[PDB]
Amino acid sequence: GRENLYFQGHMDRLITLVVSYSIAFSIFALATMAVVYGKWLYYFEIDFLNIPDLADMTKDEIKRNYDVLITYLSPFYDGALHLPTLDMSTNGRIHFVDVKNILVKIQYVMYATIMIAVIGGIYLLKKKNEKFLLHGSILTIIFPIALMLPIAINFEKSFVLFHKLLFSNDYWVFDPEKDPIILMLPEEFFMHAACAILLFILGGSILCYSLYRYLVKKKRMSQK
Ligand SMILES: CCCCCCCC/C=C\CCCCCCCC(=O)OC[C@H](O)CO
Numbered sequence: 001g002r003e004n005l006y007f008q009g010h011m012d013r014l015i016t017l018v019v020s021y022s023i024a025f026s027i028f029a030l031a032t033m034a035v036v037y038g039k040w041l042y043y044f045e046i047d048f049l050n051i052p053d054l055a056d057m058t059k060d061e062i063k064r065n066y067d068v069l070i071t072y073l074s075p076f077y078d079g080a081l082h083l084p085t086l087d088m089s090t091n092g093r094i095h096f097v098d099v100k101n102i103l104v105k106i107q108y109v110m111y112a113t114i115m116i117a118v119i120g121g122i123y124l125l126k127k128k129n130e131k132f133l134l135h136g137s138i139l140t141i142i143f144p145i146a147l148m149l150p151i152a153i154n155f156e157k158s159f160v161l162f163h164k165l166l167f168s169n170d171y172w173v174f175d176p177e178k179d180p181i182i183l184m185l186p187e188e189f190f191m192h193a194a195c196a197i198l199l200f201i202l203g204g205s206i207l208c209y210s211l212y213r214y215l216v217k218k219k220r221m222s223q224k
Pocket residue numbers: 026027030031033034037038039200201203204207208
């Protein structure tokens with residue numbers, strides 16, 4: 001009676017897979033947005049990395065320019081980028097537009113994946129299937145560990161290839177005399193920022209496994 005069973009139960013396995021990656025991407029996307037728009041890390045870094053001596057600016061000047069930049073990167077802001085006290089080139093202006101376009105598009109996919117995760121997740125949970133949580137947690141821990149290595153071994157070369165991968169021009173190659181903002185965006189900050197994203201993704205993996213372990217515990221205790 002098993003002979004007709006090779007062709008069976010394909011649909012729900014697909015939904016779990018789609019939901020698994022949507023949760024994965026959603027966590028990655030939320031982690032990125034948390035770091036890009038959260039000013040606590042950079043505010044800490046101004047003093048810790050001594051950015052005032054790197055940039056030859058005061059602590060409030062650095063915050064003023066950084067605030068204007070982060071506001072510009074918001075999807076709800078439609079004006080152009082105009083730094084309060086720093087010079088900027090045409091190509092530099094074009095680079096920050098590219099950055100904003102990346103952030104907007106990631107947010108758009110993120111909205112789709114969050115709704116696939118929620119709707120697909122309610123469907124599977126109402127089937128008493130909490131497996132998308134396990135698979136989702138697996139993807140969220142493999143991804144940061146896999147990228148930990150290029151950050152640790154050679155962060156600087158990873159930075160250049162990351163840029164060569166995401167951007168289609170060389171405008172990301174800032175000249176401090178034409179785009180002085182680069183002085184107050186030191187590479188060590190980007191490394192802390194990159195490490196911050198992975199930690200949030202890692203934290204997301206913990207939260208998913210923990211909810212998976214809770215639901216499994218409920219069914220086995222439901223037996224008892
Ligand atoms: C189970 C999945 C868990 C997902 C959690 C993975 C880690 C992501 C961290 C935070 C996400 C929620 C925080 C809100 C996300 C957007 C943050 C933001 O927009 O920053 C605004 C800024 O604080 C204004 O100054």
